[PDB]
Swiss-Prot record, chain B:
Entry-linked Pfam families: Response_reg (PF00072), Trans_reg_C (PF00486)
Annotated GO MF terms: phosphorelay response regulator activity; transcription cis-regulatory region binding
DNA-binding region: 128-225
Function, as annotated: Member of the two-component regulatory system PrrB/PrrA that is involved specifically in early intracellular multiplication of Mycobacterium and is essential for its viability. Upon phosphorylation by PrrB, functions as a transcription regulator by direct binding to promoter regions of target genes to positively regulate their expression. Autoregulates its own expression.
A Gene Ontology cellular-component term: cytosol
Positions of modified residues (4-aspartylphosphate): 52
Protein name (record): Transcriptional regulatory protein PrrA
Organism: Mycobacterium bovis (strain ATCC BAA-935 / AF2122/97)
CDD domains from the UniProt entry: REC_OmpR_PrrA-like, trans_reg_C
Subcellular location: Cytoplasm
Length: 224, 226
């Protein structure tokens, strides 16, 4: 069974997720704070991490930040919220792959964890090398992007999304298609694609507009 | 005179390594992706392969996975960027024999290729009889490890490490001794390769029981029961 590490400082929530994930067929490790999470992720390399944000000792954004800083691309789904002020999440920018807002039904978590694992296990490899869209160069196998020769600092899932868009440059890919290709969903009511699209547009334009949102149709990377 | 196949999708790096290895005495073949690598390895069997992990068409992990599935034990050193930890570890886990991180100086690669060739296909051990360590049996001639009667699936270099440790059962061997005995190194190296493999090996042994593979901090590693 895939090993899922669940991290939450609320012991009731932690036990409830542990039980439900185990009954859904996962091997489950648990951690009560970010320090314990990092220890567990080290001792027992999990296939995916479900990570609460607000915790003592070391919080969830710090855990994501540390994992990514250490070149650990383990799939991470954060249990977060959108700020009230300023609609930020709150772990995604720092490097998490997906999110869920409490309270949530277990089926929503299971669906997201299976998607995390489906992406993680994918061995599909493109023939694409470096793809050019105006001033943007996307080195697909090298996982680097530059705009006018200047590196664009992207998270793993920001780059995964940019990569798919560039593999199909000039094509309009719908939210459902991107949920499938980039997040590995096979089922959803989530805004996570739209959020990440906004992240990419902001980083890419830090510039002509290269990433377009075509309302009711989808998203497209194309030299304006 | 030994034939080395070098594989990298960065044409500048590929060209540099081709030049440098040829000057250093090797017959060099090149490939730009994993499909070209498999074709080259198939059509003119190299003595060693230097293999970039991240490439289009077929990546280095897939290359190694294919070679090992076909029971081709050709030595492979995988290359990767410093930050691409997960990728090079994946290539080691899939069966590669060593790694080198980019960027590197050519001497570091030449040294690792000479080592690969020294330790290609058979171990610095002479035991014939299967060696027992509690529930573990290491049959060096048969290249088989079993724990409580069930095979442990090890890569070639994982098995090489276990075989040296079992030949020297109960004895502590240091990281530098293991680089020389298992990896064939004759030079000082900055590498985590021994630790990486000790980890994979330990995880596989522990598998179904007792810890048999012990790390003696500051001293080395030892295979023994209890
Ligand atoms: Mg909390
Ligand atoms: Mg490459």
């Amino acid at each position: 069974s895939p090993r899922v590490l669940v991290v939450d400082d609320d012991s009731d929530v932690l036990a409830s997720l542990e039980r439900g994930l185990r009954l859904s067929g996962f091997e489950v490790a648990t951690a009560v704070d970010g320090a314990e999470a990092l220890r567990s992720a080290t001792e027992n390399r999990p296939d995916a991490i479900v990570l609460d944000i607000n915790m003592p000792v070391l919080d969830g954004v710090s855990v994501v930040t540390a994992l990514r800083a250490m070149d650990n691309d383990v799939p991470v789904c954060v249990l977060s919220a959108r700020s009230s002020v300023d609609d930020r999440v709150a772990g995604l920018e720092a490097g998490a792959d997906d999110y869920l807002v409490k309270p949530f039904v277990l089926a929503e978590l299971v669906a997201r964890v299976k998607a995390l694992l489906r992406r993680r296990g994918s061995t599909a490899t493109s023939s694409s090398e470096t793809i050019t869209v105006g001033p943007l160069e996307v080195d697909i196998p090298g996982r680097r992007a530059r705009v006018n020769g200047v590196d664009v600092d992207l998270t793993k899932r920001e780059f995964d999304l940019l990569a798919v868009l560039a593999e199909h440059k000039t094509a309009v890919l719908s939210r459902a298609q991107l949920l499938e290709l980039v997040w590995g969903y096979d089922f959803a009511d989530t805004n996570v694609v739209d959020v990440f699209i906004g992240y990419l547009r902001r980083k890419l334009e830090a510039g002509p507009r290269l990433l377009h949102t075509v309302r009711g149709v989808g998203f497209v990377l194309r030299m304006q």
